[PDB]
Amino acid sequence: QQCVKLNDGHFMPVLGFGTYAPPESKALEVTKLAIEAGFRHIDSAHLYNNEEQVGLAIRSKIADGSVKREDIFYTSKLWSTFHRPELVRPALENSLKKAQLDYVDLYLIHSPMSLKPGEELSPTDENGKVIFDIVDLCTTWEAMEKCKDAGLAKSIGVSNFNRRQLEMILNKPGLKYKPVCNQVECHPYFNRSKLLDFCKSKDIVLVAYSALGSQRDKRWVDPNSPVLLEDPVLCALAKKHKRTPALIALRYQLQRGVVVLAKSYNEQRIRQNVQVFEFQLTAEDMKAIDGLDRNLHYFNSDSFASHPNYPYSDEY
Numbered sequence: 001q002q003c004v005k006l007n008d009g010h011f012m013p014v015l016g017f018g019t020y021a022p023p024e025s026k027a028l029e030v031t032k033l034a035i036e037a038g039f040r041h042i043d044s045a046h047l048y049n050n051e052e053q054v055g056l057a058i059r060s061k062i063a064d065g066s067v068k069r070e071d072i073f074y075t076s077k078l079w080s081t082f083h084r085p086e087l088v089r090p091a092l093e094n095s096l097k098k099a100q101l102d103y104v105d106l107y108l109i110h111s112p113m114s115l116k117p118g119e120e121l122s123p124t125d126e127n128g129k130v131i132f133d134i135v136d137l138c139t140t141w142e143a144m145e146k147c148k149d150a151g152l153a154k155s156i157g158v159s160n161f162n163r164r165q166l167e168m169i170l171n172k173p174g175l176k177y178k179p180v181c182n183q184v185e186c187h188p189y190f191n192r193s194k195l196l197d198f199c200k201s202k203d204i205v206l207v208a209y210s211a212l213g214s215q216r217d218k219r220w221v222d223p224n225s226p227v228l229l230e231d232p233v234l235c236a237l238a239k240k241h242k243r244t245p246a247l248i249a250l251r252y253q254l255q256r257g258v259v260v261l262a263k264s265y266n267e268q269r270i271r272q273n274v275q276v277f278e279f280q281l282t283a284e285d286m287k288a289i290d291g292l293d294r295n296l297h298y299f300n301s302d303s304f305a306s307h308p309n310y311p312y313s314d315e316y
């Protein structure tokens with residue numbers, strides 16, 4: 001409903017539902033709850049191994065008449081072991097086959113860190129470092145363009161790119177389509193203000209994940225890291241507005257022109273998150289939240305920090 005117009009003329013709802021949870025179905029149940037609560041933008045990926053269940057949930061809410069297909073904005077992502085140009089369309093077609101849909105609304109390069117092709121999601125060496133691939137990302141992008149022209153994806157964009165990595169695509173000779181979006185880690189402890197200003201200058205929408213502080217998976221999160229939603233400024237703002245620290249975090253993104261994802265597998269929290277549209281943070285609230293920035297990415301593991309194209313080496 002509240003939507004941004006993408007640089008390709010398509011529209012994306014500003015609030016999105018995060019479908020990923022740790023390997024520990026449930027995806028089916030909570031995705032239907034999300035749609036029932038009012039979410040229209042649904043975020044999945046090959047990586048999540050949940051596209052059958054998320055696709056099922058969406059089609060179920062269309063079949064029962066709750067929504068029409070054109071009312072749902074469905075995103076999947078090309079996994080980093082499928083960057084070689086010849087793998088891209090088959091990876092999209094397989095995503096579509098799993099979801100049982102004709103097209104995705106949005107197909108993303110999940111990460112700028114190409115990995116060796118194969119059946120493993122993150123092939124790693126004896127030293128825990130990912131086995132990386134040298135495929136030119138511009139050729140991956142050209143294959144994404146062809147997926148858009150084939151009608152298999154209404155829009156195409158990227159995820160986890162820094163400014164440099166974005167400029168590589170933007171500066172490609174023969175570029176047909178700019179990415180519509182860059183989906184990146186973004187929250188009050190890592191607000192990406194410089195990258196956000198850059199994206200806006202290029203008509204690229206910044207889409208925030210881990211907007212509620214991440215699920216803190218022991219596999220990649222520093223257990224030392226502060227819990228975002230325990231932040232005392234966020235909790236003081238929540239008390240002032242009679243909302244919750246989660247709502248304060250989501251609303252912050254909306255007011256700075258960031259499209260925001262929120263994962264919840266809890267029925268009460270799913271319904272709560274749609275309340276982000278019900279209230280407004282003041283100019284001073286926003287400045288206070290801006291002051292929380294610690295440049296803190298919660299995804300913080302050697303396995304990927306070792307990768308030559310790790311986006312967090314650059315200033316932004």
Ligand SMILES: NC(=O)c1ccc[n+]([C@@H]2O[C@H](COP(=O)([O-])OP(=O)(O)OC[C@H]3O[C@@H](n4cnc5c(N)ncnc54)[C@H](OP(=O)(O)O)[C@@H]3O)[C@@H](O)[C@H]2O)c1
Nearest residue numbers: 018019020043209210211212213214246262263264265266
């Ligand atoms: N492109 C990428 O590389 C990338 C990376 C990470 C995530 N993502 C996407 O973004 C989505 C969200 O990111 P995220 O998974 O890191 O999670 P998140 O949205 O930051 O959520 C963190 C935790 O917040 C809790 N929560 C939700 N609403 C709450 C509320 N109102 N009050 C208190 N707690 C609340 C949830 O726990 P409960 O489930 O118990 O409510 C959830 O596990 C993912 O599911 C995925 O779709 C993409």
Ligand SMILES: C[C@]12CCC(=O)C=C1CC[C@@H]1[C@@H]2CC[C@]2(C)C(=O)CC[C@@H]12
Nearest residue numbers: 111112122160220299300301303304311
């Ligand atoms: C979640 C993830 C996937 C599969 C896996 O095995 C390990 C990780 C941890 C690091 C994540 C990566 C996805 C790519 C990320 C988001 C970036 O662009 C920087 C941090 C990096």
